[PDB]
Amino acid sequence: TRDEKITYLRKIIGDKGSDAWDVAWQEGVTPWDQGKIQPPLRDFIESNDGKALVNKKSDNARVLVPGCGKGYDAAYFASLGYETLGADLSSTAIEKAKEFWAESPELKSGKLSFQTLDFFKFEVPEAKYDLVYDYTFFCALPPDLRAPWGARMRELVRPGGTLITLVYPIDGARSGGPPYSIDVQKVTDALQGPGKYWTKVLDIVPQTSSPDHVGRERLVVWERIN
Ligand SMILES: Nc1ncnc2c1ncn2[C@@H]1O[C@H](CSCC[C@H](N)C(=O)O)[C@@H](O)[C@H]1O
Ligand SMILES: Cc1cc(C)c(S(=O)(=O)O)c(C)c1
């Protein structure tokens, strides 16, 4: 049962820390994997507020998708014409992502790119990213990692760039391990260490949530300011 898979996942993470992730991937305990992007992402992009960003897209607009897993989101942004990097801690995940998207034109062209990278450790390219998409990443991090997460986000997103955060699961007081209950407030506190580094341009309830996501998810768009 999936409740067992979560319980086991919390065990490995308690024992092996961040290394538990590649373990979980190769052992096949991946109860988060949904096979596809979350509908809110597509709807936002196809919406007019989102169309604004994609027409602002420069020739080499770069997208980072941290904790990308099998990389559905990365592959989505690549299909929009963005040079896109999907990065997961787990080389298994990165291998399973290259299989899953093996037939993607963007994988062949290089637009889409999957790499085993530690979000906290890798070398932020000097150009920085025009767009970062965080889904089921922030909520995977133990609470003591949210400030580094926000700190990293500040260096990763070029000024005037965009950070999209599908904030999920908004589950209230639930004290469980991964996935942690989060809310916009917890994201805001991490990102701004009010108004210091980001502008929250857009904070909405998606009209198109997955059914198990309904009432537990908000899409928030953040602009990087100097
Ligand atoms: N420091 C870190 N850097 C990069 N990826 C990490 C990471 N810590 C955990 N992860 C990865 O984030 C994922 C947690 S769940 C995968 C969720 C994925 N975004 C999806 O929509 O399916 C795991 O794949 C885990 O390996
Ligand atoms: C990191 C992580 C882990 C789990 C178990 C889940 S899920 O069970 O709610 O699908 C999600 C969404 C993210």
Domain coordinates of the chain in residue numbers?
A: 1-31, 35-224
Q: Which two tokens stand for residue 148?
A: 């580094």
Please count the residues of the chain: 226
Q: Which two tokens stand for residue 121?
A: 């450790």
Structural determination approach: X-ray
Strand extents, DSSP E, the chain: 62-66, 83-88, 112-116, 129-135, 157-167, 198-204, 218-224
Contact 68, 97 (CB under 8 A): yes
Instruction: List, in order, residues 6 or more apart from 164 with CB less than 8 Å away.
Output: 41, 44, 131, 132, 133, 134, 219, 220, 221, 222
| Cα–Cα nearest to 146, from 200, 89, 190, 192 | 190
Contact 170, 225 (CB under 8 A): no
**Ligand 1 lined by 33 (C-beta under 6 Å):** yes
**CATH for 35-224, among 3.40.50.150, 3.40.640.10, 3.40.50.970, 1.10.1040.10?**
3.40.50.150
Q: What angle do CA 203, 208, 213 make, to 5 degrees?
A: 80
**Ligand 1 lined by 38 (C-beta under 6 Å):** no
Task: Measure 30 CA to ligand 2 centroid, in angstroms.
Answer: 8
Which of 2, 21, 120, 217 has the most ligand 1 atoms within 8 A of CB, as the residue to mutate? 21
The DSSP letter of residue 21 is H
Distance of alpha carbon 25 from alpha carbon 12, whole angstroms: 12
Residue 166: count other Cβ atoms within 10 Å of its Cβ: 24
Distance of alpha carbon 76 from alpha carbon 78, whole angstroms: 5
HEC profile for the chain?
Answer: CHHHHHHHHHHHHHHHHHHHHHHHHHCCCCCCCCCCCCHHHHHHHHCHHHHHHHHHCCCCCEEEEECCCCCHHHHHHHHCCCEEEEEECCHHHHHHHHHHCCCCHHHHHCCEEEEECCCCCCCCCCCCEEEEEEECCHHHCCHHHHHHHHHHHHHHEEEEEEEEEEECCCCCCCCCCCCCCCCHHHHHHHHHCCCCCEEEEEEECCCCCCHHHCCCCEEEEEEECC
| Cα–Cα nearest to 156, from 182, 130, 187 | 130
Atom number, ligand 1, closest to the C-alpha of residue 22: 26
20: helix, strand or coil: helix
Ligand closest to Cα of 6 equals 2
Task: Measure 53 CA to ligand 2 centroid, in angstroms.
Answer: 29
Handedness of CA 146, 152, 154, 159 (dihedral sign): negative
- Residue 212 has phi, psi (to 5 degrees) of -65, -15
**Ligand 1 lined by 221 (C-beta under 6 Å):** no
Q: Which two tokens stand for residue 82?
A: 């963005």
Give the experimental resolution in Å.
2.4
**Ligand 1 lined by 168 (C-beta under 6 Å):** no
**Ligand 1 lined by 122 (C-beta under 6 Å):** no
**Ligand 2 lined by 178 (C-beta under 6 Å):** yes
Contact 206, 194 (CB under 8 A): no
Ligand closest to Cα of 170 equals 2
Residue 33: count other Cβ atoms within 10 Å of its Cβ: 15
Distance of alpha carbon 118 from alpha carbon 87, whole angstroms: 8
Strand extents, DSSP E, 10-123: 62-66, 83-88, 112-116
- Residue 181 has phi, psi (to 5 degrees) of -70, 130
Contact 181, 172 (CB under 8 A): yes
**Ligand 2 lined by 25 (C-beta under 6 Å):** no
**Ligand 1 lined by 32 (C-beta under 6 Å):** yes
Can you name the residues that pair with 107 across neighbouring β-strands?
Answer: none
